[PDB]
Amino acid sequence: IETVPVKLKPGMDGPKVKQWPLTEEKIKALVEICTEMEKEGKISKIGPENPYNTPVFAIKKKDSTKWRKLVDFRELNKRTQDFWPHPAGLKKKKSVTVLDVGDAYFSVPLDEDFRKYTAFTIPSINNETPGIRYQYNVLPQGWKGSPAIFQSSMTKILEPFRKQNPDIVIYQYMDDLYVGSDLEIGQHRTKIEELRQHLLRWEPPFLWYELHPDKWTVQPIVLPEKDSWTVNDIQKLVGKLNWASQIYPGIKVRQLCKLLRGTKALTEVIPLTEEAELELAENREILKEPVHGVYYDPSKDLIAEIQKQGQGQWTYQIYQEPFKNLKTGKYARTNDVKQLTEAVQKITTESIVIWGKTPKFKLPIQKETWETWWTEYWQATWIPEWEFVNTPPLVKLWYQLEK
Amino acid sequence: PIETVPVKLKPGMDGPKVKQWPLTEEKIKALVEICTEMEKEGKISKIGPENPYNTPVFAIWRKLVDFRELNKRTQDFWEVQLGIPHPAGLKKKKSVTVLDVGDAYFSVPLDEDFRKYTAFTIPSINNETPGIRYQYNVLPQGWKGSPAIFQSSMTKILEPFRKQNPDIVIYQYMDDLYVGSDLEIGQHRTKIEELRQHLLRWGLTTPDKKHQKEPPFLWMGYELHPDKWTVQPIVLPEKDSWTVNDIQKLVGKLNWASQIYPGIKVRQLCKLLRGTKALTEVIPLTEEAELELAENREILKEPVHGVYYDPSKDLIAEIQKQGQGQWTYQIYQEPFKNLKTGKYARMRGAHTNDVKQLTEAVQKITTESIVIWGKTPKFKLPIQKETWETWWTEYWQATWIPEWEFVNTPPLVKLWYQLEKEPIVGAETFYVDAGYVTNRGRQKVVTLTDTTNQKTELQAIYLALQDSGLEVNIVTDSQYALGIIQAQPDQSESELVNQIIEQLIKKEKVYLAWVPAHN
Ligand SMILES: CC[C@H]1C(=O)Nc2ccc(F)cc2N1C(=O)OC(C)C
Numbered sequence A: 001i002e003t004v005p006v007k008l009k010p011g012m013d014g015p016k017v018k019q020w021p022l023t024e025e026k027i028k029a030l031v032e033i034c035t036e037m038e039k040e041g042k043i044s045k046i047g048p049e050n051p052y053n054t055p056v057f058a059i060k061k062k063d064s065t066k067w068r069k070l071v072d073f074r075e076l077n078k079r080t081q082d083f084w085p086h087p088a089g090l091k092k093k094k095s096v097t098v099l100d101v102g103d104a105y106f107s108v109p110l111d112e113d114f115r116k117y118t119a120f121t122i123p124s125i126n127n128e129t130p131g132i133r134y135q136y137n138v139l140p141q142g143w144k145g146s147p148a149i150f151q152s153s154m155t156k157i158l159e160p161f162r163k164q165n166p167d168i169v170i171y172q173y174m175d176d177l178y179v180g181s182d183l184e185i186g187q188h189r190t191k192i193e194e195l196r197q198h199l200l201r202w203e204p205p206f207l208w209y210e211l212h213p214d215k216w217t218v219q220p221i222v223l224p225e226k227d228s229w230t231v232n233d234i235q236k237l238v239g240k241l242n243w244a245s246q247i248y249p250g251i252k253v254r255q256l257c258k259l260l261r262g263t264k265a266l267t268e269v270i271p272l273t274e275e276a277e278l279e280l281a282e283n284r285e286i287l288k289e290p291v292h293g294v295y296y297d298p299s300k301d302l303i304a305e306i307q308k309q310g311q312g313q314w315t316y317q318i319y320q321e322p323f324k325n326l327k328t329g330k331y332a333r334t335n336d337v338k339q340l341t342e343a344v345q346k347i348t349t350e351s352i353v354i355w356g357k358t359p360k361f362k363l364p365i366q367k368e369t370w371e372t373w374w375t376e377y378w379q380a381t382w383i384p385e386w387e388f389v390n391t392p393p394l395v396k397l398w399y400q401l402e403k
Numbered sequence B: 001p002i003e004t005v006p007v008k009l010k011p012g013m014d015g016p017k018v019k020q021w022p023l024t025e026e027k028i029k030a031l032v033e034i035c036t037e038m039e040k041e042g043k044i045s046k047i048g049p050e051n052p053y054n055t056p057v058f059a060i061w062r063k064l065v066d067f068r069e070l071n072k073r074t075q076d077f078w079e080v081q082l083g084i085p086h087p088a089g090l091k092k093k094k095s096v097t098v099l100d101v102g103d104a105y106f107s108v109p110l111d112e113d114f115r116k117y118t119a120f121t122i123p124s125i126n127n128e129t130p131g132i133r134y135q136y137n138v139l140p141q142g143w144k145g146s147p148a149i150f151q152s153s154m155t156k157i158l159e160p161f162r163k164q165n166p167d168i169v170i171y172q173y174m175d176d177l178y179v180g181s182d183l184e185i186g187q188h189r190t191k192i193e194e195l196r197q198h199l200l201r202w203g204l205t206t207p208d209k210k211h212q213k214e215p216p217f218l219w220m221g222y223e224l225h226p227d228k229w230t231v232q233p234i235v236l237p238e239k240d241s242w243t244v245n246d247i248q249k250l251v252g253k254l255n256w257a258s259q260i261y262p263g264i265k266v267r268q269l270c271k272l273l274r275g276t277k278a279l280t281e282v283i284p285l286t287e288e289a290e291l292e293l294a295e296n297r298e299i300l301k302e303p304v305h306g307v308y309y310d311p312s313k314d315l316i317a318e319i320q321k322q323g324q325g326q327w328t329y330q331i332y333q334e335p336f337k338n339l340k341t342g343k344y345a346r347m348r349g350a351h352t353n354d355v356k357q358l359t360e361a362v363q364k365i366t367t368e369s370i371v372i373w374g375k376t377p378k379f380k381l382p383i384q385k386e387t388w389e390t391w392w393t394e395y396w397q398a399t400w401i402p403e404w405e406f407v408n409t410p411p412l413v414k415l416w417y418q419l420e421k422e423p424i425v426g427a428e429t430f431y432v433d434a435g436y437v438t439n440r441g442r443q444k445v446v447t448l449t450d451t452t453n454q455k456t457e458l459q460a461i462y463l464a465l466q467d468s469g470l471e472v473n474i475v476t477d478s479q480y481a482l483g484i485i486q487a488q489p490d491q492s493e494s495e496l497v498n499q500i501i502e503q504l505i506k507k508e509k510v511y512l513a514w515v516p517a518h519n
């Protein structure tokens, strides 16, 4: 009755997603959590007439020893009707603390006719029992409609702090609230508390400590700078340059190329000629800045690829049209998978902060390994889209800072 | 009674209206005695000729209703099972009783609003005698939602008994109720009687202790004892002429035994299927197929049991390389008491090395373990940490193996070669493009036949490797060949690649570089 009538996009039916198998530790955490959500009317056991399913997972958190239930609503989120802004001021604040306000949802009931689409299953070890089935009664954490539906109620609540602390940029995204302020880190955390407690007024633990958007400088392309240049060096250099010429057409190779005149031994040292020292120096300048004319339009998808740079280092880029990167960065400091998941999250927290959307990730990892271990390290409350790929050889070369 | 699960027809669709085919008067009688009693039990009820719906019915006497139309119109239900347990995950019990649940679907109400779509018709003998129309009051055999609704009811009807008796394991499977415990013989038989009474007080009837199946329980291709498990009896056929069909069925059964019989091999056997033209075609057995067959029937002559999972103890998984692209493994808890075993041969990709392939076997085993035991085992592997890290750090894809211990049990896995990371000073340099030109003036233009733009870029390099000495620097314009060699395989589907690999293993130092077009 009180609920807001929600519907799926026209023609669409509910999600029937397969639940990845879980470890008994996670199942144990999921049973304890869900048993309590049931005693409190948040979720209800469902019968066999509900054919839908969304996967569930358990994760660990920050500043806690408790488990957090994570519902993979990606599929449902895509079949849910659109609802009919984004402060670029946010990426300019000295600091931003991320809050988990997902709990505010457990008060608003959910349209009785939509509930069945929130069905999920807690699996059993070795299939020895059917699996415990449930659906949501209230707005669930992780569903695209929850922030949308609790928006009115969320503004009213923020209205005060808003006018009272005009020096703060409060941005909401899914179950997260982003709090930005140029105040000194000292006083920053104090003002966060005056927000947490003002939320209790109507809770919210920290995600991450702060992020510092202000220094999210792009990682440009660099050429090696050496004393003596062998033939091999010149060949790597031209190759790198030629590919970079796809982006920056001002890049000229002609002169460096007149150096690999014929078939010389790879290790032969080649002093560079005037015409050439000047060509390298000039290509060098063109790369000092990211290419002009690259603008983000909300109309298209944000794609993100990550490359393994070996020795605990990774590189990544964000773009919408190939070669037109909106951002390109690095990440270092564990095991391969642990790092990949942190980078993935760090890069996601960035697109959200910068453009308000999570990007589509192209990951260099076998799917089964990712599906097996990502939850052991995941801390976010959201889950971006991802596909799996193989990183060609040369793409890595062309992307890192070796001395 | 038990609560009712509401059912609906698919969106838009209307109930069934397919007319009853002619019924032999001998069959009409039969169906009237059958349907009249079903109305005496509660299963069905006569309905007034205003119910447009109707579903066919013939007689086999047992009444068999044809619901393939109503089913097409009935809503989708939550999957009935999708996944049975594996013996290796089961626990050891002192006693295990299997309780056949009779007239299961018959003892569960069917959503009232739905019943009118279950309407069927018994044709009158006389061109105008009865012509009675019935509808179901319970779950109909053959109807789309009966398996699902039944199981879901059984679960609820079992819940309390399960809370009262937490020392009793109960597994529901279609029509069987496998009940197990560690109670002493006598107490177990009493719980089995109580339970029997618990189901009864809900109408669910079962078989007496005299009539209930006694283990070994033959289930889903296995042989179950309260304390152990194996695969049902299976030794190999004796024959003079083997047909493709026989071979495939043979290969099929040998694989099945791999989950518990370590050592089974199928390679020589599989190889017989090459170029086969008909299922009925005979294929004589190679000296090698006979040896492999002879060894399989010997392994399969002495039965092996698998113990059950003891949750108090760790899981250990040990892997061995049993040939190129072949891996065997076994998971045990009690040193060498096999919970399970298996073999792994999947070659993800056209090329690979024993390291990548051992790592993929570790992921398959990890996934399997998470399904069966809900956790990952401590791994014992024939590879040293240093060989592992060394390929890890240098590979582009991201990967991660759980806690494992090196176990010096050959063959140890390793890398046969490694490409330098810097050009070699003093090594001749080949620029390949189907031939090459060296910096010392050598050249070998060769024109190949029946090639592929890609297989040609690989031949260039191969030639360069052959004519060069122990140390060599090679320059190619192929990103493709570059990718393959750089991945550093030691095994491939391609013979060419395999040739390059033998070459690379022999070299002392090889450096590969790439440069674009324009040599
Ligand atoms: C009921 C107890 C349960 C179990 O833990 N161990 C055994 C051991 C021997 C058996 F014959 C059955 C089973 N069990 C089981 O669920 O078997 C289904 C897969 C058929």
Ligand SMILES: [Mg+2]
Pocket: B431, B432, B433, B475, B476, B477, B515, B519
């Ligand atoms: Mg060339």
